[PDB]
Amino acid sequence: MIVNMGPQHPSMHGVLRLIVTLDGEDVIDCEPILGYLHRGMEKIAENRTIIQYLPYVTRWDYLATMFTEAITVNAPEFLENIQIPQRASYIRVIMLELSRIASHLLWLGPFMADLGAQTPFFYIFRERELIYDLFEAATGMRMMHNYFRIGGVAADLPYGWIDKCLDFCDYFLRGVVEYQQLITQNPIFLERVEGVGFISGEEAVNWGLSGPMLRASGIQWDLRKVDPYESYNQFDWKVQWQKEGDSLARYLVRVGEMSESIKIIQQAIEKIPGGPYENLEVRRFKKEKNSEWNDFEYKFLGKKPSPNFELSRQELYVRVEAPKGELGIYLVGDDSLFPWRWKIRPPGFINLQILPQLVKKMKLADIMTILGSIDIIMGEVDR
Amino acid sequence: PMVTGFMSYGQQTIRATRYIGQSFITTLSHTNRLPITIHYPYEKSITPERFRGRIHFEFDKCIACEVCVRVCPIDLPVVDWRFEKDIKRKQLLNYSIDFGVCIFCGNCVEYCPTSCLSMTEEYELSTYDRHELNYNQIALSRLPISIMGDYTIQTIRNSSESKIN
Amino acid sequence: ILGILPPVAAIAFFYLFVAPPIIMNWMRLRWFKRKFIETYLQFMFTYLFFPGLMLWAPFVNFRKFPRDK
Amino acid sequence: YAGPLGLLQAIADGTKLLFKEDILPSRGDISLFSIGPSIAVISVLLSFL
Amino acid sequence: LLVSSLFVTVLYLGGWNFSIPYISFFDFFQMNKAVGILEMTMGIFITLT
Amino acid sequence: GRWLDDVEKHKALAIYPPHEGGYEGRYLNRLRYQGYYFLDLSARGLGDPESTLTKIHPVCPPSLGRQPVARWYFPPEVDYRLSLLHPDAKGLIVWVYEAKVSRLQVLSKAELQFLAMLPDLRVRVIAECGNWRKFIWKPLKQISG
Amino acid sequence: TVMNLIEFPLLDQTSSNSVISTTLNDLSNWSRLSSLWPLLYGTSCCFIEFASLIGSRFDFDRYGLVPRSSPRQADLILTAGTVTMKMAPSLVRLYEQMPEPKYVIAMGACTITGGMFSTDSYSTVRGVDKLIPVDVYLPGCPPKPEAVIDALTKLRKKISREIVEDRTLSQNKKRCFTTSHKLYVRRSTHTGTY
Amino acid sequence: QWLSCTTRHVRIYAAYIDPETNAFDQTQTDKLTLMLDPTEEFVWTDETCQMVYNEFQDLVDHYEGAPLSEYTLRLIGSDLEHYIRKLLYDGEIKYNMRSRVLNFSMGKPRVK
């Protein structure tokens, strides 16, 4: 009467065991089994220094690929106030608003391959190819690993990086509307996705949800405003939301947000104090002696980086929101270099709490559509 | 009733067709497009000047800073000094790099005294057993693949490395 | 009955000799820049001269070829 | 890589599938297992008449 | 798939008929000599396409 | 035996195949029925190859982050494999897979000459390096230096 | 004074086969290697780039790599992503439930040793070969998206190194032992209800 | 059900399977059978496995008082993975020696 939907899990985000009753074709009750990917970072996080712990974050974080280092650098640099310049802050803003894209693609593409869009799977990978070159040439191998040191960042991104957005920077803009005209076309696209897994706003805030999946009910709880994160807020933007919260609302809110990414990028590349990197490159040779360059502004590193630094009792929380969902790393402010206790608060662990309450009296196909639209991944969940 | 159905049965089909034929003639330029995707394996991608491959070892650049363990994510290599009496710095005898247990951090590349820890980029690790990975001083060089130094390679630059448009 | 062999032999050999090694050249010369119906040209021929197209399909032999005595 | 093109790839997949150690699971057996695909293949093969 | 394609073309389209009627492929030349193998291969041709 | 035309006599050669390997295994299949028995090495990794083919050489195991000096003093792979070989065996067919391009010791062509003597003095070794679409073979000793 | 010497070759390995009966299996294994199909599996920090192996950056489907999402059908599985203690007691079922010409390999340096999960944690398993016998170990976390194709090319030769008599080394025996228990049963814990 | 620690060369099956086929994969799970290394990583002569068979009672009867949970299965497999290591570290048993990949879970031989 009950069968598991397979630990092999013929889905996007890895391994998920779903034990569910089956009355021939329709289901009555389903249950998830989690815990199969225990990265156990909460253990090692005490028996390590900072720099040896730096590449650890983009390991259980390879879909987001960047939304783990924001808070992982907040604790070392933003807590003890090792003053981060506003230019390096704008560089980090470029990073974060490109990771918004890194998430939008790696959801919508697979979301297209879950909803019923059979062809565009390779299309979005062909679009994403350029972000690979960017992440490679910026700091690291493929996921740009080790782009956040403590006193700033690893190294200012090279010259062929910042001023060279233009190709994808105006390509994807005209490319967005492709998906918007394709989704409203062939209502078989739309018929199966409309009117499934609907959720309200009061339960969206009562269940602890977050992200565009929650913003899609007129909640607009977008945490890209509530925090003076590295004094980023000089830029302008446009809140992305909807007023339903269901799967189609999820698609709408996650297709209407990436248009702001390149907008913020355009704000930065010309609004960064250094602007492009070749600009600051050709400017630090005529005024090598002294200027606002290399001062509290225009400096990648403030003080020496090293695995030696003591801490006081200061247990600070940040609810840094990713387009998948919120994230937080609370930690008992300890007097020792490495602290007593570590903690993570991922969106995946705060998303599936409604999962068994989502698929109610539905069919297997309905479960497939809801689980493809919910924008969920493992890695973040287990930690 | 039926008159509303006798009026809307053509409307449903005409919407279906206006969508289907439109998508068909739109993807027409896609099924016979003029893009050329990734070529054969003899056409690897271009690599700019910031990445990490096979790290390198030395005997005249690791002054015995010994930070070898204080950089890798699991304090990977050994530390070995064996009772020298030249001045005070005991020698460098025992060591073994093992990429099977190094996760490409190698962060000492940034804090090493004299350019010792460096980067390369190949990957033909025909591992028939885990215990065959003792990377000592010089054969790590091996004058690697040298993409431009091969006679069967003509690599065009990718999107972010070619020109605009 | 005497001179019947040259006609039925030459055309039957041409039916399976020249097209097999040249279809692979016409397809390798253009594969990603073709037109909407250009792929229709040589693909159909992929059957017609098939008496020999398979004889120069990957069936192309690499025997050790015992050398001249 | 299956020659010039995949003209031999198809029969290569056929020959590979040929051996592939047919497993014949426990519940249900030759009583109906081997009898299954025979009807399937004949239903379309006989239509060629 | 094959039988469905062949049946829809042999039913709704000219089976081995050219774009000009099948009998008309002989009358306009006043004589035929070796139309046998030509018509055989051309029936495999104009139909399979 | 087309390989037999250039293995028993020369005992020193290098395989220059296309860079796919989908045509060379048939050659290795035939050389199991004379007394030749396979030893694939993938030479990259070892130091001076002499002590890897004649001497008891300490192969330092992949370390576990800790434990200063710990090396299990591994043995060579020539005389012991002879001891396991029957007295009915023509030669030790060996493949130096990582012989190429186109305190370690660079396994240069001098090291291949010094691995071309164990075939003669006291293993039928063949170097490996990808090459032209046609599977060719060539005596590496003349290429060596 | 050798420790843990290797067993002796029991057979003399002296035989000769006819070409008309050998080239058959030779080309058969050639097809078996040149028509391999992947089996879908991917979990963690050494997996994601596998997807890029289907697009315009890397395309291993150019060689006929038909990705099958089922154990009993396919023969090539990539243990991508770092494996932990769990999800393994069901992983090995895959290897147990596919035809014999598997010749499985590894992928991800964190699967040959458990690289970035090897200081102290009661979850990660030290390597994969302590669970399943595979052939090739692939480095990289993330694994180099080109090194996997090179290792596939490497393994492509081992199958070509097989003969007609080699189609008997996959037959099994049974060391089935007759030993009972005396303990108390435990009812099912994974109760599927909300 | 049949939730057993099926690790390499350690498969403590919590269900009766000592036919060619168990005919249900469990046979109602009333015997707790075990099969030793089907991959032939080690070649077995009866006498060598006789000590393991004798100590099986030491592991199933001498130190078992906990219910049928995989906790006890790890309690068994732990010493099972080191009885073989001891039996090899004194040279009484050796490796596969066949035409497989010939992998070395414990590394290559040593010189004592």
Side-chain angles (χ1 to χ4, degrees), chain H residues 6-11 13-16 19 21 23 32:
Chain H
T6 69
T7 320
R8 198 211 182 105
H9 56 265
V10 184
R11 304 154 160 90
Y13 283 175
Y16 175 40
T21 57
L32 169 77

Short mmCIF file of all heavy atoms in Angstrom, two decimals, chain H residues 6-32, unseen atoms left out:
data_model
loop_
_atom_site.label_atom_id
_atom_site.label_comp_id
_atom_site.label_asym_id
_atom_site.label_seq_id
_atom_site.Cartn_x
_atom_site.Cartn_y
_atom_site.Cartn_z
N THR H 6 25.55 -3.93 5.09
CA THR H 6 26.11 -4.61 3.92
C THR H 6 27.33 -3.85 3.39
O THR H 6 27.36 -3.37 2.25
CB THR H 6 25.04 -4.77 2.85
OG1 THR H 6 24.71 -3.48 2.31
CG2 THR H 6 23.78 -5.39 3.44
N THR H 7 28.34 -3.74 4.24
CA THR H 7 29.60 -3.12 3.85
C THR H 7 30.45 -4.14 3.09
O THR H 7 30.20 -5.35 3.15
CB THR H 7 30.33 -2.60 5.08
OG1 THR H 7 29.39 -2.00 5.99
CG2 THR H 7 31.36 -1.54 4.70
N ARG H 8 31.45 -3.65 2.36
CA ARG H 8 32.34 -4.54 1.63
C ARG H 8 32.90 -5.60 2.55
O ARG H 8 33.30 -5.31 3.69
CB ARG H 8 33.48 -3.75 0.99
CG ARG H 8 34.18 -4.50 -0.13
CD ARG H 8 35.64 -4.10 -0.22
NE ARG H 8 36.33 -4.78 -1.31
CZ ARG H 8 36.67 -4.20 -2.46
NH1 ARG H 8 36.37 -2.92 -2.66
NH2 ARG H 8 37.29 -4.89 -3.40
N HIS H 9 32.85 -6.85 2.09
CA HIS H 9 33.36 -8.05 2.76
C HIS H 9 32.78 -8.21 4.17
O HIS H 9 33.22 -9.08 4.92
CB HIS H 9 34.90 -8.09 2.80
CG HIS H 9 35.54 -6.89 3.42
ND1 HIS H 9 35.99 -5.82 2.67
CD2 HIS H 9 35.81 -6.59 4.71
CE1 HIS H 9 36.51 -4.91 3.48
NE2 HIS H 9 36.41 -5.35 4.72
N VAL H 10 31.79 -7.39 4.52
CA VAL H 10 31.08 -7.53 5.79
C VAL H 10 29.59 -7.36 5.53
O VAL H 10 29.08 -6.24 5.51
CB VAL H 10 31.57 -6.52 6.84
CG1 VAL H 10 30.87 -6.77 8.17
CG2 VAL H 10 33.08 -6.61 7.02
N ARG H 11 28.88 -8.47 5.36
CA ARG H 11 27.44 -8.45 5.09
C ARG H 11 26.76 -9.35 6.12
O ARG H 11 26.52 -10.53 5.87
CB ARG H 11 27.14 -8.89 3.66
CG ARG H 11 27.86 -8.07 2.59
CD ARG H 11 28.05 -8.87 1.31
NE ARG H 11 28.28 -8.01 0.15
CZ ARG H 11 29.48 -7.62 -0.25
NH1 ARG H 11 30.57 -8.00 0.41
NH2 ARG H 11 29.60 -6.84 -1.32
N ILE H 12 26.45 -8.78 7.28
CA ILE H 12 25.74 -9.51 8.32
C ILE H 12 24.25 -9.42 8.02
O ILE H 12 23.56 -8.53 8.51
CB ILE H 12 26.06 -8.95 9.72
N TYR H 13 23.76 -10.35 7.21
CA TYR H 13 22.38 -10.30 6.75
C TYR H 13 21.44 -10.65 7.89
O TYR H 13 21.56 -11.71 8.51
CB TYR H 13 22.18 -11.27 5.58
CG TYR H 13 22.72 -10.76 4.26
CD1 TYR H 13 22.70 -11.56 3.13
CD2 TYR H 13 23.24 -9.48 4.15
CE1 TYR H 13 23.19 -11.09 1.92
CE2 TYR H 13 23.73 -9.00 2.95
CZ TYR H 13 23.70 -9.82 1.84
OH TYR H 13 24.19 -9.35 0.64
N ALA H 14 20.48 -9.76 8.17
CA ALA H 14 19.51 -9.96 9.23
C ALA H 14 18.34 -10.84 8.79
O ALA H 14 17.27 -10.79 9.42
CB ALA H 14 18.99 -8.61 9.72
N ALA H 15 18.52 -11.63 7.74
CA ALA H 15 17.43 -12.43 7.19
C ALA H 15 18.00 -13.71 6.60
O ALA H 15 19.15 -13.74 6.14
CB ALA H 15 16.66 -11.65 6.13
N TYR H 16 17.20 -14.77 6.63
CA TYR H 16 17.65 -16.09 6.18
C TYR H 16 17.84 -16.08 4.67
O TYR H 16 16.86 -16.11 3.91
CB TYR H 16 16.65 -17.16 6.58
CG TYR H 16 16.99 -18.54 6.04
CD1 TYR H 16 18.30 -18.99 6.01
CD2 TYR H 16 15.99 -19.38 5.55
CE1 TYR H 16 18.62 -20.24 5.50
CE2 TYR H 16 16.30 -20.63 5.04
CZ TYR H 16 17.61 -21.05 5.03
OH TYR H 16 17.92 -22.30 4.53
N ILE H 17 19.09 -16.05 4.22
CA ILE H 17 19.40 -16.31 2.82
C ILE H 17 20.61 -17.23 2.73
O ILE H 17 21.75 -16.77 2.68
CB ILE H 17 19.64 -15.01 2.05
N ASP H 18 20.37 -18.54 2.69
CA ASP H 18 21.46 -19.43 2.32
C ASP H 18 20.94 -20.46 1.33
O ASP H 18 21.34 -21.63 1.36
CB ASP H 18 22.05 -20.12 3.56
N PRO H 19 20.05 -20.06 0.44
CA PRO H 19 19.83 -20.80 -0.81
C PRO H 19 20.58 -20.13 -1.94
O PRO H 19 21.22 -19.10 -1.73
CB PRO H 19 18.31 -20.74 -1.00
N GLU H 20 20.54 -20.71 -3.14
CA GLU H 20 20.95 -19.95 -4.32
C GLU H 20 20.19 -18.64 -4.41
O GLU H 20 20.76 -17.60 -4.76
CB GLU H 20 20.75 -20.79 -5.59
N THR H 21 18.90 -18.67 -4.08
CA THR H 21 18.06 -17.48 -3.98
C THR H 21 17.15 -17.62 -2.77
O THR H 21 16.53 -18.68 -2.58
CB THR H 21 17.21 -17.28 -5.25
OG1 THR H 21 16.41 -18.44 -5.48
CG2 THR H 21 18.09 -17.01 -6.46
N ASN H 22 17.06 -16.57 -1.96
CA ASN H 22 16.26 -16.61 -0.74
C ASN H 22 14.76 -16.76 -1.01
O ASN H 22 14.02 -17.05 -0.07
CB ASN H 22 16.51 -15.35 0.09
N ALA H 23 14.32 -16.52 -2.25
CA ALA H 23 12.94 -16.69 -2.70
C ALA H 23 12.01 -15.62 -2.13
O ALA H 23 10.85 -15.51 -2.55
CB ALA H 23 12.42 -18.09 -2.36
N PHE H 24 12.51 -14.84 -1.18
CA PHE H 24 11.82 -13.63 -0.73
C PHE H 24 12.79 -12.52 -0.36
O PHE H 24 12.33 -11.46 0.08
CB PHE H 24 10.90 -13.94 0.46
N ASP H 25 14.10 -12.74 -0.49
CA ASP H 25 15.17 -11.83 -0.11
C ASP H 25 15.29 -11.75 1.41
O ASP H 25 16.23 -11.15 1.93
CB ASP H 25 14.97 -10.44 -0.72
N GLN H 26 14.34 -12.35 2.12
CA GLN H 26 14.39 -12.39 3.58
C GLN H 26 14.07 -13.75 4.19
O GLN H 26 14.61 -14.05 5.26
CB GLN H 26 13.44 -11.35 4.18
N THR H 27 13.25 -14.59 3.55
CA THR H 27 12.76 -15.83 4.14
C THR H 27 12.22 -15.59 5.55
O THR H 27 12.50 -16.35 6.49
CB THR H 27 13.84 -16.91 4.15
N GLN H 28 11.45 -14.51 5.70
CA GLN H 28 10.81 -14.07 6.94
C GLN H 28 11.80 -13.59 7.99
O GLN H 28 11.39 -13.25 9.11
CB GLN H 28 9.92 -15.16 7.54
N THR H 29 13.10 -13.56 7.67
CA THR H 29 14.13 -12.99 8.55
C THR H 29 14.15 -13.67 9.92
O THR H 29 13.88 -13.05 10.95
CB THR H 29 13.95 -11.47 8.69
N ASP H 30 14.46 -14.96 9.90
CA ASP H 30 14.46 -15.76 11.12
C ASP H 30 15.76 -16.51 11.37
O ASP H 30 15.80 -17.36 12.27
CB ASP H 30 13.29 -16.76 11.10
N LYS H 31 16.82 -16.25 10.61
CA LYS H 31 18.05 -17.02 10.76
C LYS H 31 19.30 -16.15 10.90
O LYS H 31 20.25 -16.56 11.57
CB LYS H 31 18.21 -17.98 9.58
N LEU H 32 19.30 -14.97 10.29
CA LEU H 32 20.44 -14.05 10.33
C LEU H 32 21.69 -14.72 9.72
O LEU H 32 22.65 -15.07 10.40
CB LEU H 32 20.69 -13.55 11.76
CG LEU H 32 21.97 -12.78 12.15
CD1 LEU H 32 21.92 -11.34 11.67
CD2 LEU H 32 22.22 -12.85 13.64
#
